[PDB]
A paper describes a structure:
Aldo-keto reductases (AKRs) are a superfamily of oxidoreductases capable of reducing carbonyl to primary and secondary alcohols, found in all phyla. In this work, we identify the enzyme [name], which is responsible for tylosin reduction. Phylogenetic analysis indicates that [name] is the founding member of subfamily D within family 12 in the AKR superfamily. Specifically, by combining steady-state and transient kinetics, X-ray crystallography and molecular dynamics simulation, we demonstrate that [name] exhibits a positive synergy mediated by an unusual Monod-Wyman-Changeux (MWC) paradigm of allosteric regulation at low concentrations of the cofactor NADPH, but an inhibitory effect at high concentrations is observed.
Beyond that, we also obtained a binary [name] structure in complex with tylosin at 2.25 Å resolution. The overall construction of this structure is similar to the the first apo structure and all 16 subunits are in the cofactor-free state. However, the tylosin molecule is bound to each chain at the allosteric site consistent with that observed in the ternary complex structure. Intriguingly, each octamer in the structure has half dormant and half active conformation which are grouped into two tetramers, consistent with the aforementioned MWC allosteric model.
Author numbering:
A (entry chain F): 1 to 229, 249 to 331
B (entry chain D): 1 to 227, 249 to 331
C (entry chain G): 1 to 21, 28 to 52, 59 to 89, 95 to 231, 248 to 331
D (entry chain C): 1 to 21, 29 to 52, 59 to 89, 95 to 230, 247 to 331
E (entry chain E): 1 to 21, 28 to 52, 60 to 87, 96 to 230, 249 to 331
The structure:
Amino acid sequence: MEYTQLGRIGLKVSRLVLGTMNFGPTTDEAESHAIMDAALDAGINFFDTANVYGWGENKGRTEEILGSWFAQGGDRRDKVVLATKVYGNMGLDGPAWPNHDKLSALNIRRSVDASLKRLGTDHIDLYQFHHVDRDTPWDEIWQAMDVLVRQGKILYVGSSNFAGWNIAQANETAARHGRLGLVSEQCLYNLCERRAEMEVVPAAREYGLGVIAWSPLHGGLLGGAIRKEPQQREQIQRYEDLLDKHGLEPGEVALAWLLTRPGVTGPIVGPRTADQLASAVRAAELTLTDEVLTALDEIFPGPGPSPEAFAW
Amino acid sequence: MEYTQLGRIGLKVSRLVLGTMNFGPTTDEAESHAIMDAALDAGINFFDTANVYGWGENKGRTEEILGSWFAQGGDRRDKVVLATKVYGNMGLDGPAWPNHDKLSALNIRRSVDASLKRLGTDHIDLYQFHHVDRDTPWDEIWQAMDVLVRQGKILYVGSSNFAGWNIAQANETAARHGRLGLVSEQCLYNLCERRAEMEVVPAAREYGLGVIAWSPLHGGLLGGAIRPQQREQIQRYEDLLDKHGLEPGEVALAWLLTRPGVTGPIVGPRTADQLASAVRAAELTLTDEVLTALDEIFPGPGPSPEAFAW
Amino acid sequence: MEYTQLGRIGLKVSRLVLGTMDEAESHAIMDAALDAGINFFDTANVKGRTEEILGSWFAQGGDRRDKVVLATKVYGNPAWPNHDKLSALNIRRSVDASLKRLGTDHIDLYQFHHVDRDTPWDEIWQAMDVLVRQGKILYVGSSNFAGWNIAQANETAARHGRLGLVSEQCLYNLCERRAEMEVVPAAREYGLGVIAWSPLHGGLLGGAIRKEQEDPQQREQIQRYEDLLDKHGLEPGEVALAWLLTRPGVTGPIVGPRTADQLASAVRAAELTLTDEVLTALDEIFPGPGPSPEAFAW
Amino acid sequence: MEYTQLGRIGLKVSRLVLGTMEAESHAIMDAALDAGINFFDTANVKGRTEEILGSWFAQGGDRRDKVVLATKVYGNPAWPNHDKLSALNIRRSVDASLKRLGTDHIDLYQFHHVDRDTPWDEIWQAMDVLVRQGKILYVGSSNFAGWNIAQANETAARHGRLGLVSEQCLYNLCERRAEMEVVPAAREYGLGVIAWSPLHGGLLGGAIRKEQKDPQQREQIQRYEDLLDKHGLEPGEVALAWLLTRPGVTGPIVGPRTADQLASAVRAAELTLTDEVLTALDEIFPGPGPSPEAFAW
Amino acid sequence: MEYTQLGRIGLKVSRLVLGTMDEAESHAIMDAALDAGINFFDTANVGRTEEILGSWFAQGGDRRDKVVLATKVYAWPNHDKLSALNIRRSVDASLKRLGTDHIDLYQFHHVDRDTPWDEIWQAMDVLVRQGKILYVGSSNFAGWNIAQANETAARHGRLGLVSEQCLYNLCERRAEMEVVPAAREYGLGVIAWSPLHGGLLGGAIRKEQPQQREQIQRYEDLLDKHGLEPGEVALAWLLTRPGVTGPIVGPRTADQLASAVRAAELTLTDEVLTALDEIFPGPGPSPEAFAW
Ligand SMILES: CC[C@H]1OC(=O)C[C@@H](O)[C@H](C)[C@@H](O[C@@H]2O[C@H](C)[C@@H](O[C@H]3C[C@@](C)(O)[C@@H](O)[C@H](C)O3)[C@H](N(C)C)[C@H]2O)[C@@H](CC=O)C[C@@H](C)C(=O)/C=C/C(C)=C\[C@@H]1CO[C@@H]1O[C@H](C)[C@@H](O)[C@@H](OC)[C@H]1OC
Ligand SMILES: CC[C@H]1OC(=O)C[C@@H](O)[C@H](C)[C@@H](O[C@@H]2O[C@H](C)[C@@H](O[C@H]3C[C@@](C)(O)[C@@H](O)[C@H](C)O3)[C@H](N(C)C)[C@H]2O)[C@@H](CC=O)C[C@@H](C)C(=O)/C=C\C(C)=C\[C@@H]1CO[C@@H]1O[C@H](C)[C@@H](O)[C@@H](OC)[C@H]1OC
Ligand SMILES: CC[C@H]1OC(=O)C[C@@H](O)[C@H](C)[C@@H](O[C@@H]2O[C@H](C)[C@@H](O[C@H]3C[C@@](C)(O)[C@@H](O)[C@H](C)O3)[C@H](N(C)C)[C@H]2O)[C@@H](CC=O)C[C@@H](C)C(=O)/C=C\C(C)=C\[C@@H]1CO[C@@H]1O[C@H](C)[C@@H](O)[C@@H](OC)[C@H]1OC
Ligand SMILES: CC[C@H]1OC(=O)C[C@@H](O)[C@H](C)[C@@H](O[C@@H]2O[C@H](C)[C@@H](O[C@H]3C[C@@](C)(O)[C@@H](O)[C@H](C)O3)[C@H](N(C)C)[C@H]2O)[C@@H](CC=O)C[C@@H](C)C(=O)/C=C\C(C)=C\[C@@H]1CO[C@@H]1O[C@H](C)[C@@H](O)[C@@H](OC)[C@H]1OC
Ligand SMILES: CC[C@H]1OC(=O)C[C@@H](O)[C@H](C)[C@@H](O[C@@H]2O[C@H](C)[C@@H](O[C@H]3C[C@@](C)(O)[C@@H](O)[C@H](C)O3)[C@H](N(C)C)[C@H]2O)[C@@H](CC=O)C[C@@H](C)C(=O)/C=C\C(C)=C\[C@@H]1CO[C@@H]1O[C@H](C)[C@@H](O)[C@@H](OC)[C@H]1OC
């Protein structure tokens, strides 16, 4: 297992991030636990979850499954860098009661308290915004997060689905008064969707955030979606054909590709079974030749950074 | 129900603020709870109280009435933005024991501890100065408030009965050391009394404070004389509202909801009927003719310096 | 002559400020204002031509420049964009024009003519700091601000080491006391000198009814004022000025004497002691609103 | 003429920016003055253009006093430090610009492009030297990313300095990707947005009828020209007028070579587009939306 | 010619830095250095030197505009060291001797432990703000002097040291303990003075015909097996070192220039690098260098 610093900070994490969104809705508790043990066994120390995982009327269930996993002891809590999120509506799906979603200090307080109860732990290592909230100013957000820091309830703060300028504004605001800023950004990033390269990833790299790629196979579409059974199909076909030609698995290459991108800490890997985890772990050891990198780049061009992306 | 951001911050509030001053002194606990459930049903999430509500020897009773409401469960606490106040004498009415009113860190400590006990909760969402205290510096006040923020005992700080320059001084002082300053001013504003517009509301807007109008009916006066220079003015008002078939109480509220910078008025119902009426005032549109008429009868000063100079 | 600190700063000024309004006639009161010990000269009308007349005054030598605290103002007054108001652009052009007309290399107190709510204080303080570091200006003052504008301005200045506004020139007199609600409280809090403009309310407090004989309610008021002073042996124009010199935070009124007789009258106004009984009755005739928020709430 | 604040600052500008893209230049600049345009930029829609402004100002008649003068860093294989935004390159470019313009100050000095190799403490040192000498009033950007505006202005504010007051970016019906992050950031930080190539190099200027490329781009332009035929609207005027409806936009740079093109740009600033016309332009020329919603959710 | 950012700043310099050791022949070698694409001129020895540069710019032809001009500071009290007093008199004399209105890189000649940084940055900021100096650099500092200096400048918004000139070559590698780590952390370019250790790595044992001589012998003998010139290799070695901007070279002739230029084009094999590292061990970073 390859390890790296999470951006500029002192925290070392596995290049694979274990996603947990399947634990609860699709994978049962006992199997989720076996996967998490398997993940530790493979050297994966970075586990990602969210208050809202579990979905609909079972929001919170995933956090509860990690809580029962820690409760078995055996140094599980101690070995893991635990990440969860705040922003989402935790009540009935649909329009939220005011201040029961988004990033007011009010929603942060109630969300973190509920997450700590479900996770059965006194601290979260990486507390992440699920999304930018353009209505909440950073002096409010940093007040909320600093209260939790100083109480020992969280260590690090991270972002998810931010724009590049939000990352800059957050970290400049934090730095003004000596606070550690965002340490990581979780953006949608994969061969199909490369527009994070325009500004989100450049900002992250400037400010020393780790970059965590969610949906690394683009919902499945890069995992061998055509062999399984618009003009997007021609790309995918050319993709599989190129990987047939070279003997490589689609699912594994989508992950290995992300590992070659500048600034990228690693992909979120969201296995349903211990078999799919072991595949992810192979993808991490895989080495991709400069020839196959050119090919994928030709099939899946990236925008490049702004302003060059749309101007010069 | 129309919602809005409280000034520049991420908190979203109903444009009606439920005032609780009647809960205890005139409306009773059981009925107060009735009204507060109806306010939730109406989409009102913003509840305003104060330690001194109750009046006389019953000061504190409103806070307790809120406390027993939260104790019923059903996510009542979790659904409200709870706001209370510090400054007032909580002992026997008349001259205060020193440091038992006003805004010394000493009075702030003892006031918040008693409010949290009565309210039956571990935190207040919005803790408001009831009035400006010009004898207490902002480095002292913000120390006291910052202690409460970091302990998780309050989230936001607001003001009430400030001058505009007090708003600027407070928030400039907070911003110097990276603190969130005042998020709202609760000022006396209505058709009769519009001198908040000279400097209070301009200042609040510059600094991104919510503006919450208290005494939106000027203590009943804008409610009815059906039941000397000023009698004449109110007469002209009630006659205008007879012409258009509009309730006086509803227009005074809806008018404040047209003012630039105004979050909304504090509505203080004695009864569930008075509440449903406030909700109706929130739904009212006022024609440009009615707005222009009210402005003639009840002129505003406009901003300083233009208000008295040019 | 009574002298005072201009607010919190180290500059000492006369409690009479010499405002404005022939050339050698102006030079003569100015020399006379000096001999009377008035050191604080302001180009505010009680623009371009007045500066030139000060300019020719200084050009005569005799330590005239060295002896005076020279205050001027952004020119102001349908204008071409940026030829009014307080952009860094307008400030640059107004100051350079003023220095050329005043025929001096520095202005002691450079003042804003009016609040401009479209220009942020980091822009304004940039423009002023350029001039301070070049030595073209010493102190910065306001005119026709709100209390909160004074607060914003001095807080912004103080964040980066800068001296803020040292003075505010506002309309303040027996007739118009609404400066007392917030402007003068803000000024007092931040250590600004308050310079009272139109101290006689455009002449209304200088004995305008007795000068008429040679609005219903306001006339009743002036009439009750002239009669109170008749009763007390006191010149109205002098009492208007003396009243202001009793008010908390007031540096002094602007006066525009054109003769030894008018200068001597302002000087006697500054030496005048109004009795508690006079002050009590003036307060009754011309009530102030008190500070906000007590002024309109409690 | 419609006037606006340049972003958050107190400087008032016309919503048309005269891109000076000698004798026929001088003529059009006087007509722009008389039309109430006070905002003159040396951005091409550099070298000679500045000299042409300099001889304009040397004619006198309060011309320098009446204009907001904006220029740019020159830019350009370059000799080291004769391109980009080192303090060394800024000194030499401004000194040469002041010489050519025959003026002792520039009102708005702009970066020509983001330089990723120069830290903002270096850039702000260079600009603060000039501001404190009086050679420059305001600073602006061109061809920046959203995060570069944020970084610039946070760095400036930290030590009390006025940051960027304006960004010049490529923005028109055809190219709307500035809306992802550049314009959002400019709006957050209170920069004026100045739209260069507002007709996308003539292409929105009725380019298919002046024939009297890619198949899909031509299809798009065709519907545009047909929509405006239907409504009786000049395509050149509409491209400009659409930019004036966009949140955050101060205005477009125009390079009128004739009284006719000037008068046209002036009419565009007075034109009101109906909601139906706005809906239809939007359908033909869709914007990406703000990031992250533009590519995520 | 190879170019690099000077540390973290936006200034681009040649990886060879032209130092100095009559008049029209200095002028001619400077012209030749431009033609080879060297833009970085330093008055440091590898008064009169500044005057020679002055007459060079006085010829015109965009000579001043094409070069990054670096000079340095420098006993009667305050006529040495880094007092605001000596800085002022030294820079005034430099600008006159150099016949220019600005210096691109103004460098301290040595650490002065008796002057605080608030006094030094006052003096530098005055000059930066009058336009007389762009960038500030150090020479012969400790690592902690670099940290203190740049932390002090950052406090009040000011650009700190952009470069350190230290004694660094195969023979003297102790700058690697802390000076070069500090410079790397703070984003200073590292300029290697005496890159040939006074000519000891320039083929000295051949030129003549204790246990230091043993070292130089294994060096010269290794460079015979590979068909490499010692002069060139000591330069190329430094160019492979982390944090190094480049060496100060003082060519007097077109012939030595061309040697310097070749040494910047040269690529040493990992075999050669490994062998140089064996003959000339470095201490590593503190605290590992002396503890663990
Ligand atoms: C002590 C001496 C007397 O008292 C005064 O002379 C005080 C008056 O000057 C007040 C303030 C005036 O009222 C003021 O008139 C100004 C023109 C307004 O100023 C305006 C214009 C502005 C530019 O100044 C601006 O800044 C400001 C905000 O608005 C101002 N405003 C605040 C509204 C307003 O208070 C007048 C209007 C005319 O002058 C109001 C009327 C009803 C009046 O005569 C009242 C008299 C009273 C109560 C007492 C006695 C005599 O009153 C006697 O009281 C005894 C008990 C009996 O003898 C009585 O007889 C039966 C009676 O005799 C007459
Ligand atoms: C390996 C070389 C091949 O090159 C490619 O396969 C590259 C293509 O995949 C490009 C990028 C596609 O064009 C992309 O189509 C996506 C659906 C869009 O993505 C969408 C969806 C989104 C979610 O991704 C979003 O983020 C994005 C912004 O918009 C995307 N956009 C950035 C606009 C757009 O570039 C396709 C559209 C369909 O697939 C465009 C068509 C006209 C095309 O074939 C063009 C050129 C070339 C030279 C093809 C050769 C084949 O030619 C021959 O193919 C043989 C198989 C080889 O062996 C060679 O023969 C020896 C070779 O010869 C040259
Ligand atoms: C729109 C219809 C009428 O207009 C109004 O009714 C407006 C009035 O309400 C004004 C403002 C009042 O004057 C206010 O009296 C308040 C008690 C003061 O409030 C006090 C107390 C406070 C608590 O509010 C405090 O906050 C404040 C600062 O001070 C307040 N102050 C700001 C000074 C002061 O403006 C009244 C006093 C009594 O109401 C003054 C009297 C002499 C008056 O009527 C004068 C002029 C005009 C032009 C009247 C028209 C025409 O009247 C007729 O209207 C018909 C519709 C037409 O067809 C015409 O008929 C022919 C026309 O007649 C020509
Ligand atoms: C007004 C309604 C019409 O809708 C439009 O005309 C919308 C089109 O203009 C879209 C956006 C174009 O697609 C764009 O093609 C550009 C070349 C790309 O731009 C490029 C270049 C760039 C420089 O812009 C760059 O910045 C950008 C990122 O990529 C751009 N990209 C953002 C991906 C891409 O959206 C076209 C391709 C060319 O015109 C795509 C094709 C398949 C298409 O027609 C699809 C759907 C519809 C529903 C058309 C109707 C016609 O149908 C009927 O047409 C009648 C005339 C109407 O009146 C209606 O009748 C009622 C209507 O019926 C509903
Ligand atoms: C490739 C392998 C070769 O390895 C070297 O040649 C490495 C040597 O250069 C080391 C480092 C020297 O030791 C250094 O001697 C300098 C004068 C000191 O420098 C001084 C002065 C300063 C100014 O530099 C200062 O900065 C510094 C701190 O202190 C320095 N210091 C760090 C203390 C000190 O390490 C020598 C002294 C002379 O050269 C010390 C003695 C005990 C010695 O001969 C040891 C080993 C040898 C001979 C190994 C062979 C060569 O010898 C044969 O080479 C053949 C090619 C092969 O067959 C080999 O087979 C393995 C072998 O055979 C026997």
